Amino acid sequence: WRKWNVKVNHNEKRYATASAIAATAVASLVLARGHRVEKIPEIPLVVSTDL
Amino acid sequence: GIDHTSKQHKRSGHRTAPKSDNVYLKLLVKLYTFLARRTDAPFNKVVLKALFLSKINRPPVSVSRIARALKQEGAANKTVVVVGTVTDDARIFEFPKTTVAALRFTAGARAKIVKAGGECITLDQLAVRAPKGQNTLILRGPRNSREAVRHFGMGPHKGKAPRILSTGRKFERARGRRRSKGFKV
Amino acid sequence: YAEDNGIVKALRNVPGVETANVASLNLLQLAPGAHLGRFVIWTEAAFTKLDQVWGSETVASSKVGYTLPSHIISTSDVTRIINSSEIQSAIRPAGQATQKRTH
Amino acid sequence: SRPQVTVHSLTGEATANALPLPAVFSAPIRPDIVHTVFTSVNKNKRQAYAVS
Amino acid sequence: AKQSLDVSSDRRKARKAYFTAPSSQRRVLLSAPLSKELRAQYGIKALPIRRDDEVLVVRGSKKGQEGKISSVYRLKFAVQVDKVTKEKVNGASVPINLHPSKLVITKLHLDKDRKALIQRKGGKLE
Amino acid sequence: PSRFTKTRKHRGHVSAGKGRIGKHRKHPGGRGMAGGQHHHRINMDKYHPGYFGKVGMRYFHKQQAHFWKPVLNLDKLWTLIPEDKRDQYLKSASKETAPVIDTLAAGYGKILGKGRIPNVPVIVKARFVSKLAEEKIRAAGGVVELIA
RNA sequence: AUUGGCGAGAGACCGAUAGCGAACAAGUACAGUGAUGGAAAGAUGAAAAGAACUUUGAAAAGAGAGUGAAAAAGUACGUGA
RNA sequence: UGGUUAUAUGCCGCCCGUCUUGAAACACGGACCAAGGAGUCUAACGUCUAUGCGAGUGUUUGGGUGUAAAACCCAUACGCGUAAUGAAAGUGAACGUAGGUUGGGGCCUCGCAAGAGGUGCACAAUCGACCGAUCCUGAUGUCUUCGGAUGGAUUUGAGUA
RNA sequence: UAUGAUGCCCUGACGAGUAGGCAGGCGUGGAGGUCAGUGACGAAGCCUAGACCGUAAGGUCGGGUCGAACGGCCUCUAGU
């Protein structure tokens, strides 16, 4: 009966998902986590719907 | 073997840096350190102290106290500054036009101030519009009207709300609280 | 993706790649090891549906009782705000960076 | 004036169709909140272990 | 990736199902691939091993020696080809155990159940 | 958690934060609230004035449904009106279009007066009012209807 | 509802003085009139190829020779504090 | 030259741990070595910090869903909070730009500056006002014993302001 | 432009301490990310009056032995 699972406030969980989505913008952060994207087109990369 | 008049290596007791790791707040501190160091006007060294303050010492400041400070004479064109949040208040209905600057505005306060024709201003825009703080106010919310501050200083004859969980009858209103049961206080 | 038509079975074998619906967007996939940043290959329908999902000033929420977080600062650049027009008018003239040792 | 990300086709060949940024990318990037929420959200898959 | 809830990726369970499998599944674990000649002949990648096949070694210190199996030795997960031996210092000959996933089959030994077994798996035999 | 705890900073020290003289021992003052009228009387007087003794009438078989009475000051009383209708109702303050407020369906058992509602006459439907409450509502022009 | 039985699936669990008393012929060996108590004990090597043969000795073993990538891997066997 | 190490010489240096006013003790543990080995987890809370919203807040009892013990979304209620006080019946917070005065950060105006004046949030002190209780006063009307208006008191509360 | 603003630099004062409090770091088993890290042309461990770094916990290297896995860093965690 150790406290295994941990609550988060729902809005703070939403806050972190919003900040992470905002972080997959401009590629300073993207090159900061591995991610060999040194030559890609403009970031975010949006492929068309056929995929 | 120096005689010690006061205590050695005594930290001054204030904060010099906010304990929070809000990066954007570190940017506002990084701006106001510059402005406090070089503009050498008083208004800047007060807001720098206020960003250092904790959550408790930044109480939320309702929009009605802003309405009081604007009904206060002569301040009817000033830009009120609140370091800390500004929360809504449904008790006022009439509300003036002037501009408010703060860190955080709750959605009710944003809708209210923009609804009356005002403008919510993040403090960098006030640093742009007022480097020396021309024609401004500072409000501070009530600090010691917390829940917890009701409980400090508890002792006999001082009247400060004993620390208790469930109230009503039967929970600490017997001997020690009334004259009929033993003693009072 | 926005609308799954057999894409997850296509990419689920090639290692490292994880797919996601816009309705999910797990935090465990968007910042692994709590480090911000992923190489996110959006799709177009997913991009317009992202506009629908997380709200803006234009569309309202799609999550009951939600709006985006707000800025406590308008511009993330600081020295641009420091330099630009108004502040340098009020700034006293600077000293030396490191001080001369006197005595 | 959103930065107008161009849709890209499957063979490279950047299609001239441009789409605005959906203002989710103008959200504040708070690394610490992502950090604390990643800790407390990553804890939520643990099975219990115990001695007899 | 594992999709069913029926099979286990637990490592202990796999090695436990391996080292204590009974001999009837040890005919199945000791499958051996076929040559290119045979999969052009029969059209099938691999079969279980049997004691009379003519087989060739493709890995090890006996790489290239071919021969017939003498006996399949299912306790040690082994297969003793008759030509592959190691002489002992007192003059004797001791068969070297090979593992049949490292062999290549050249000539089979078809009776009925090898015939019907090839028929079940896409046979095109002669 | 335990990499941040202070016994992890106390390894190496013999008493582990608990002193050599008065050793850390099991329960030196008894278990729990023991001795409140005895050796701990100086803790029951101050910080707990009133803990010992009976007072009231006993109340057998209480039900909080008999005491459901959530109050409402006059100075909220407009959150109960929808906000998009609120500016319609504050403007053109007149009778025959007076708003109707049901305090009951919002969960408000009694109206209490607290001070200075605006001057728009408003029909308020409630279960209980106070003497200062109906006087302020009546001074605004609107009326009160007691419902059950 | 479910620390039992059967059949499964998993872990930010322990890793052999830990994890069940028991990873091994473990409720075993052994103690006790008895009720009951109750251990210790994993890993040579890919493969026994586990040292043919010569020589000293009553023999055990020795020293050569040989196996094996390696016997500072020889069954008193991973490393070996 | 210098470092390390052994030895030499000069001078110094009593076995550590522990209770103890006091230990090298003729006080107690310690022959030695390896591995094990002691302020943890939970329920409920206090102070302070950090975070999210903010007159509100808490998705996770449960439902929809799924790349399925995670993730994402959600209607109800419900907990705490926005209102106190009494044994209880009950009652229930603006006289007055939600007051006065004093001291107060900051701002504004004049002044070259020094200083003068206005404004004074937070907070301290103090006088008042309002709410509940208690002790009184007790009117217009009265199911003719009810109803309590008004006004008070070296009273009182863990209240409003 | 070219680097850290929880940096760099100037000035001054001061620095014993049991019980105890606080802060800054070192070390161990496991988890997420990362260095497209090391590794049977030899990991990890062990021995070493051989060498270097840190005030110290500790780190790093050279040699011998050895035979398969393991380390730095940003974070989580405890049967540390």
Swiss-Prot record, chain A:
Cellular localization per UniProt: Cytoplasm; Nucleus
Post-translational modification: N-terminally acetylated by acetyltransferase NatA.
Its job: Component of the ribosome, a large ribonucleoprotein complex responsible for the synthesis of proteins in the cell. The small ribosomal subunit (SSU) binds messenger RNAs (mRNAs) and translates the encoded message by selecting cognate aminoacyl-transfer RNA (tRNA) molecules. The large subunit (LSU) contains the ribosomal catalytic site termed the peptidyl transferase center (PTC), which catalyzes the formation of peptide bonds, thereby polymerizing the amino acids delivered by tRNAs into a polypeptide chain.
Subunit details: Component of the large ribosomal subunit (LSU). Mature yeast ribosomes consist of a small (40S) and a large (60S) subunit. The 40S small subunit contains 1 molecule of ribosomal RNA (18S rRNA) and 33 different proteins (encoded by 57 genes). The large 60S subunit contains 3 rRNA molecules (25S, 5.8S and 5S rRNA) and 46 different proteins (encoded by 81 genes). uL4 is associated with the polypeptide exit tunnel. uL4 interacts with its chaperone ACL4 and the nuclear import receptor KAP104.
The family this protein is said to belong to: Belongs to the universal ribosomal protein uL4 family.
Extra remark beyond the main annotation: There are 2 genes for uL4 in yeast.
Protein name: Large ribosomal subunit protein uL4A
Gene this protein is translated from: RPL4A
Residue span relative to the full protein: 106 to 156 of 362
Curated annotation (Swiss-Prot), chain B:
UniProt KW keywords: Cytoplasm, Isopeptide bond, Methylation, Ribonucleoprotein, Ribosomal protein, Ubl conjugation
Key word NAD present: no
GO terms of molecular function: RNA binding; structural constituent of ribosome
GO biological process, one term: cytoplasmic translation
Modified residues (N6,N6,N6-trimethyllysine): 49
PROSITE patterns: RIBOSOMAL_L18E (PS01106)
Principal localisation: cytoplasm
Any one of the GO CC terms: cytosolic large ribosomal subunit
Domain of life: Eukaryota
Subcellular location: Cytoplasm
Classification via InterPro entries: Ribosomal_eL18, Ribosomal_eL18/eL18-A/B/_CS, Ribosomal_uL15/eL18, Ribosomal_uL15/eL18_sf
Record location of the Glycyl lysine isopeptide (Lys-Gly) (interchain with G-Cter in ubiquitin) cross-link: 115
More info: There are 2 genes for eL18 in yeast.
Family designation: Belongs to the eukaryotic ribosomal protein eL18 family.
Function: Component of the ribosome, a large ribonucleoprotein complex responsible for the synthesis of proteins in the cell. The small ribosomal subunit (SSU) binds messenger RNAs (mRNAs) and translates the encoded message by selecting cognate aminoacyl-transfer RNA (tRNA) molecules. The large subunit (LSU) contains the ribosomal catalytic site termed the peptidyl transferase center (PTC), which catalyzes the formation of peptide bonds, thereby polymerizing the amino acids delivered by tRNAs into a polypeptide chain.
UniProt-recorded name of the protein: Large ribosomal subunit protein eL18A
Species the sequence originates in: Saccharomyces cerevisiae (strain ATCC 204508 / S288c)
Swiss-Prot record, chain E:
Subcellular location: Cytoplasm
Keywords tagged on the record: Cytoplasm, Ribonucleoprotein, Ribosomal protein
One MF term in the entry's GO annotations: RNA binding
Single GO cellular component term: cytosol
Glycoprotein in keyword set: no
Family matches, as SUPFAM superfamilies: Translation proteins SH3-like domain
Listed NCBIfam families: rplX_A_E
Similarity comment: family membership: Belongs to the universal ribosomal protein uL24 family.
Additional notes on this entry: There are 2 genes for uL24 in yeast.
Function: Component of the ribosome, a large ribonucleoprotein complex responsible for the synthesis of proteins in the cell. The small ribosomal subunit (SSU) binds messenger RNAs (mRNAs) and translates the encoded message by selecting cognate aminoacyl-transfer RNA (tRNA) molecules. The large subunit (LSU) contains the ribosomal catalytic site termed the peptidyl transferase center (PTC), which catalyzes the formation of peptide bonds, thereby polymerizing the amino acids delivered by tRNAs into a polypeptide chain.
Identification of the protein by name: Large ribosomal subunit protein uL24A
Organism, scientific name: Saccharomyces cerevisiae (strain ATCC 204508 / S288c) (Baker's yeast)
Upper lineage: Eukaryota, Fungi, Dikarya, Ascomycota, Saccharomycotina
Swiss-Prot record, chain F:
PROSITE patterns: RIBOSOMAL_L15
Motif (Nuclear localization signal): 6-12, 23-29
Region (Disordered): 1-38
Classification via InterPro entries: Ribosomal_uL15, Ribosomal_uL15/eL18, Ribosomal_uL15/eL18_sf, Ribosomal_uL15_CS
Alphabetized Gene3D superfamilies for the sequence: 3.100.10.10
Major site of localization recorded for this protein: cytoplasm
Disulfide bonds: none
Cross-link position per record: Glycyl lysine isopeptide (Lys-Gly) (interchain with G-Cter in ubiquitin): 95
Transit peptide in keyword set: no
Keywords (A to Z) from UniProt: Cytoplasm, Isopeptide bond, Ribonucleoprotein, Ribosomal protein, Ubl conjugation
Record carries keyword Cytoplasm: yes
One term under GO cellular component: nucleus
Biased segments, Basic residues type: 1-13, 20-29
GO molecular function: RNA binding; structural constituent of ribosome
A GO biological-process term: cytoplasmic translation
Localization terms from the record: Cytoplasm
Subunit structure of this chain's protein: Component of the large ribosomal subunit (LSU). Mature yeast ribosomes consist of a small (40S) and a large (60S) subunit. The 40S small subunit contains 1 molecule of ribosomal RNA (18S rRNA) and 33 different proteins (encoded by 57 genes). The large 60S subunit contains 3 rRNA molecules (25S, 5.8S and 5S rRNA) and 46 different proteins (encoded by 81 genes).
Role: Component of the ribosome, a large ribonucleoprotein complex responsible for the synthesis of proteins in the cell. The small ribosomal subunit (SSU) binds messenger RNAs (mRNAs) and translates the encoded message by selecting cognate aminoacyl-transfer RNA (tRNA) molecules. The large subunit (LSU) contains the ribosomal catalytic site termed the peptidyl transferase center (PTC), which catalyzes the formation of peptide bonds, thereby polymerizing the amino acids delivered by tRNAs into a polypeptide chain.
Family, similarity comment: Belongs to the universal ribosomal protein uL15 family.
